[PDB]
């Protein structure tokens, strides 16, 4: 009584994969067959299901219109067609027989690793500053590699609005940006200061580098 | 100096949607025009780029071949045809004028939301247990809803291995499990006991409900 799984590997975003399990030692035709995945360092989560070539296929929402479950009863094989793969699809995939009141998932595949992957990293600290108006705000943005030409820029976002430009070229202020907003740093230690805080200033602040053709963003520090 | 965005809305997986920025107030036929996007709760992330007639056109890895950026200079318009849309494409979409050393992303569209759209919750405690052999262990699993037919199983998973069925239908110890393992409880309070810890029992333990059409798993308990 066993399921032999096959497939997986490294792909680039937007690629395709197929998985498979062949069942040995039980009645594939009456079993329900499910798929279940575990992201690295995480727990288990269900992907898709199919019954007795019923067919009556069921899919988790994350994978809808991208993934496709199918079975070949004559070949005792379950499949999972995986299209337009996203980084978020990275995980160990298992096939499992569903026994219901008679075993739950009693037969498991061993697991195959499906990894999706393809650069300057911006790291803001802290994630959160609780300050009061008038107080100073000092946001760090540290780069994994030196930002040439000091092509680093800060934006501000207020909920439901587009982002607003603040500093560009490290320390150059934008069209209509108050002087309490200061940008400084060079190379990889950039730092935005708000010398005293205004009530409107309470928002999320992102940093941005355009020193290459792959533009990147920090995660935002939030100010409260 | 303006970008007037239009388009978007709610679509089902595999749907189609074209966006539009109409340019006013500058020499549009010569500007570098980008598209940027923010998925709800997350931060900014670049999407696409277009510039003069002898320039390249750039797409983020996760969109290539589905989205198509274009432009009608004669009508001062930027487009983004989006095809084969999927949940992970759910986000607010912005157009922006790129200024580089002269200001980076210095003009934006207001943004339009694009949403692509077509459960019992198990909670384990404690999350970690450091014990020595001979001691007894006690692992909880609570169900947000009530598990019908007490259709709740327990699995063991060791370092990098598929999981192993321990208990099912609440209390049924699977063929081959030491009798120091017992599962008990019903409704929403299930609990599994390991009465004399052998060293080989040290691993992670999951729980699972198959009562409904959307199976679910607890987070796991680590026993050390």
Numbering used by the authors:
A (entry chain B), B (entry chain A): 1 to 118, 124 to 229
Give the article text.
Diabodies are among the smallest of these bispecific antibodies. In order to investigate the structural flexibility of the Fv interfaces of diabodies, we have determined the crystal structures of 10 mono- and bi-specific diabodies with and without bound antigens.
In monospecific diabodies, two identical VH-VL protein chains form a homo dimer. In order to confirm this, we determined the structures of six additional monospecific- and bi-specific diabodies with amino acid substitutions at position 83. Note that the diabodies we used had substantial sequential diversity in their C”D and EF loops. The second Fv domains of all the diabodies are clustered in a small area, demonstrating that substitution of the positively charged arginine greatly reduces the structural diversity of diabodies. In conclusion, we have found that substitution of the positively charged arginine in the EF loop greatly reduces the ambiguity in predicting diabody structure.
